[PDB]
């Protein structure tokens, strides 16, 4: 029956909650009190890449950690050479409304989505000079909030239709649609082994899927509002999710429950991006108070502030080798810090 | 020093010049956001003005390049992508004026108008609302009074009084007054006049923006 099914689901959820609570003897803060703090870390703006003439809503560092692709609403996504500030490509967009960006691990392709609901995949290493649209993946009922490259052949996209998809680029059709969310899937993040990713949606919950078969392996709650961004602890067994209630948490996959939360009283503004350092100790977080607060993902004590942006920081990314962190804000300037 | 990096910097400067030219020629194009209310004759006015996700109806009028952004065909959390539309020179609106008895529908349209006219993002962008289906609205009101859609209405059940009441109520919803004047039109004349109204209202919006930036208001 509908009522009996609903109450059975409710008691099953209560069992989930009590089981996960019983498997929590000491919080991360107590265990991490002994280790000394990271102190204060001051990182200057080594570079300020200024080519965009409108807001920039996303970027992604290259695998080599030198090329970063950044997409603005002026109809362009630019492939900056962060070391020298040069732009190696200025790809125009069929639809100027772009809300995501991705740079393929091999570096050949890039991808960008947006309000058009179409993830356009551009090919860079083409023997023609100009960047050509390798594919235009379509099939999402809503906008694309975040698309990430699994390989040069598979791309996982998160849309506003409350579902994720695993497009096979060659055939340009979904090979697996991840359902289970109840709101706009605002952000996505792949594992270091790329064997399973997570998606954070507007229903205030982050889901751990498994790309192989496409089922939500785990579900994490705790946030009181949207989840605007997620990243993994480089270990691949814990992920930190931003939110619109000015709080980024740290869930762990093995224990399958929230570990701790990074909320500071004088911040009332929603997150927009989250990232880790290559060591996973310090946690970047792009607040829309025009600056990103570098936390310490073992004690919650804030470790710094990279306040150098005129407008909201909408995209953030730590290089693969951890040598720099690039933050891009709605003022059209994205800055590299080190 | 810069063995062939000189050529790379030259390429960077070339595409930077291209970006600057594109930005300059895109700043001279007025961007309008067309919301509507669903089944509100958005397609009709789109076709008249022309002379999946969102459809951009780029067109030109009197050497002015309008870029009209129709986001009606998108069902999701509006607040998440609405902030993408800061700086749109105007926010066209559509109201199925004949849809006063439909169901209540105009009440949902009013709720949508209040939500989108008071968003923190659109605190300055003026709204150009068209009350479509004027003739059909006249016939419907002739058939039945307007009190069905508004129990508080107290006036003649004629086209003039009812249209004035609806126009007043739709101009009453913008709480953030004195910063965004909204222009109301009755898009039912099957002639090349709606685009003319959009043009002579966007020119007013541009003049207001210019004299605000220039420091004259």
């Amino acid at each position, epitope marked *: 029956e509908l009522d009996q099914l609903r109450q059975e689901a409710e008691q099953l959820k209560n069992q989930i909650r009590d089981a996960r609570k019983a498997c929590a003897d000491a919080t991360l803060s107590q265990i991490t009190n002994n280790i000394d703090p990271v102190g204060r870390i001051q990182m200057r703006t080594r570079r300020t890449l200024r080519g965009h003439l409108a807001k920039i809503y996303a970027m992604h560092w290259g695998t080599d950690s*030198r090329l970063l692709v950044s997409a603005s609403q002026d109809g362009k996504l630019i492939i900056w*050479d962060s070391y020298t500030t*040069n732009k190696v490509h200025a790809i125009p967009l069929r639809s100027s409304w772009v809300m995501t960006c991705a740079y393929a691990p091999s570096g050949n392709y890039v991808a960008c989505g947006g309000l058009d609901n179409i993830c356009s995949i551009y090919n860079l290493k083409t023997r023609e*000079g100009n960047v050509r649209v390798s594919r235009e993946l379509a099939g999402h009922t809503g906008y694309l909030s975040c698309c990430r490259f699994l390989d040069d052949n598979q791309i996982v996209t998160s849309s506003g239709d409350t579902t994720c998809a695993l497009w096979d680029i060659e055939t340009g059709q979904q090979t697996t649609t991840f359902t289970g969310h109840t709101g706009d899937v605002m952000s996505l993040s792949l594992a270091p082994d790329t064997r399973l990713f997570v998606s954070g949606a507007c229903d205030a919950s982050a889901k751990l899927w498994d790309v192989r078969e496409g089922m939500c392996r785990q579900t994490f709650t705790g946030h009181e509002s949207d989840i605007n961004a997620i990243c993994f602890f480089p270990n691949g067994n814990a992920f930190a999710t931003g939110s619109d209630d000015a709080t980024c948490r740290l869930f762990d996959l093995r224990a399958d429950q929230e570990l701790m939360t990074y909320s500071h009283d004088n911040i009332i503004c929603g997150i927009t991006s989250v990232s880790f350092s290559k060591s996973g100790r310090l946690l970047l977080a792009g607040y829309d108070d025009f600056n990103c607060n570098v936390w310490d993902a073992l004690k919650a004590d804030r470790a710094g502030v990279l306040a150098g942006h005129d407008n909201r920081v909408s995209c953030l990314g730590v290089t693969d080798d951890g040598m720099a962190v690039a933050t891009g804000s709605w003022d059209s300037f994205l800055k590299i810090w080190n | 020093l810069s*063995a*062939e*990096d*000189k*050529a790379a910097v030259e390429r960077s400067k070339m595409i930077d010049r291209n970006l600057r030219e594109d930005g300059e020629k895109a700043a001279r194009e007025v961007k309008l956001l067309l919301l509507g209310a669903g089944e509100s004759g958005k397609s009709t006015i789109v076709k008249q003005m022309k002379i999946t996700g969102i459809v951009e109806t780029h067109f030109t009028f009197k050497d002015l390049h309008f870029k009209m952004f129709d986001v009606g065909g998108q069902r999701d959390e509006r607040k998440k992508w609405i902030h993408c539309f800061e700086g749109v020179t105007a926010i066209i609106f559509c109201v199925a004026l004949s849809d006063y008895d439909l169901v209540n529908r105009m009440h949902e349209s009013m709720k949508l108008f209040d939500s989108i006219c008071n968003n923190k993002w659109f605190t300055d962008t003026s709204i150009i609302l068209f009350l479509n289906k004027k003739d059909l609205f006249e016939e419907k009101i002739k058939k039945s009074p307007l009190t069905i859609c508004y129990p508080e209405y107290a006036g003649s059940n004629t086209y003039e009084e009812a249209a004035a009441y609806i126009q007043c109520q739709f101009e009453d919803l913008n709480k953030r007054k004195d910063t965004k004047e909204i222009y109301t039109h009755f898009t039912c004349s099957t002639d090349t006049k709606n685009v003319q109204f959009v043009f002579d209202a966007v020119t007013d919006v541009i003049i207001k923006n210019n004299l605000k930036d220039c420091g004259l208001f």
Partner: single-chain antibody
Amino acid sequence: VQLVESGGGLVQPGGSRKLSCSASGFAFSSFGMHWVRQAPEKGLEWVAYISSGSGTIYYADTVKGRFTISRDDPKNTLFLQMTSLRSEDTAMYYCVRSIYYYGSSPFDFWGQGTTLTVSAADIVMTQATSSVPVTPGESVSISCRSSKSLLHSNGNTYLYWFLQRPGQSPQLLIYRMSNLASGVPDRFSGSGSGTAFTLTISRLEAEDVGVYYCMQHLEYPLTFGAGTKLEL
């Protein structure tokens, strides 16, 4: 991608001539273009260069002023107007594509050449050997000894290896001394260090016999090598 060249004739010495390079397939506007000549018996030799948009132009010291090089993107053509043709310019001229961005493949595509007969501070780069006996299957090596160290301060060591099969247009094999041009078998490898470089061929096939030219790109003029011809 295709480059077709025309304008080769028996020009009287001291005269004038024009050489046209028509480009099809690729976005000729974004591609810088070099003109590289080759004497009937000698090795390659740089002639002229235009960047993208004609912003920068360079000429070899031996044709400076005499040869004026221009381009027209809308017509997709590259012109070389050359005047006062001494007997030393009786060379076939190749039209070489080149795109300069981080991780690019400059000099990747070469034109087909135009036979052109005329009636009667640099970086010297030496080739240790000019002719070696090669068995079809035995690995071989070729050495290129520069004079000025080519290991630029920013890691890049600009040294390209080109292959010219008999009766064909030379093609790019390796760029920056350790890479592979698209469509080149992995058998080719590049190694060494600044001022001494090596190209190794493993499991040599019958399609590799030819002349291997060593080039540098540290600074113009881009003095080529003397060529190390292989044989069966």
